[PDB]
Amino acid sequence: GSPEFRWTKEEEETRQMYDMVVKIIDVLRSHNEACQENKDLQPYMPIPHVRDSLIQPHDRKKMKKVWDRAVDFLAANESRVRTETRRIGGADFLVWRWIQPSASCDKILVIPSKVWQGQAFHLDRRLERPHRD
């Protein structure tokens, strides 16, 4: 019945909580830096891409059940992938997919408040901001 705001102090609540989540906040913040370069390096993945990611082999799921609680810590400060309900094979399930902040998200408003070179181009060379490596 109220929003979160999410500024610098909201971290003081989450600090001590980070134990198992530090691996998954590492998975999302890490894949992100390579992702803003490219379009989205992850276009669609399941809930287990991130829920298997806490551990790699046969013991993979053993902290995916803990993840149910770990999300209480994540969700007060970070969501560096997008949540969507999507239809696959005629059936609608919940999947997690990539959103990358900075470098891609650039635009011009009513007053073109920029100088010649630094950012992109204008009129000539009608592409997007990130390019082929």
UniProtKB/Swiss-Prot annotation:
Name under which the protein is recorded: Inner nuclear membrane protein Man1
Tissue: Heart, brain, placenta, lung, liver and skeletal muscle.
Location within or outside the cell: Nucleus inner membrane
DNA-binding stretch(es), residue numbering of this chain: 58-77
Origin superkingdom: Eukaryota
Function, as annotated: Can function as a specific repressor of TGF-beta, activin, and BMP signaling through its interaction with the R-SMAD proteins. Antagonizes TGF-beta-induced cell proliferation arrest.
Gene: LEMD3
Assembly: Interacts with SMAD1, SMAD2, SMAD3 and SMAD5. Binds to both phosphorylated and unphosphorylated R-SMADS.
Disease / disorder: Buschke-Ollendorff syndrome: A disease characterized by osteopoikilosis and disseminated connective-tissue nevi. Osteopoikilosis is a skeletal dysplasia characterized by a symmetric but unequal distribution of multiple hyperostotic areas in different parts of the skeleton. Elastic-type nevi (juvenile elastoma) and collagen-type nevi (dermatofibrosis lenticularis disseminata) have been described in BOS. Skin or bony lesions can be absent in some family members, whereas other relatives may have both.
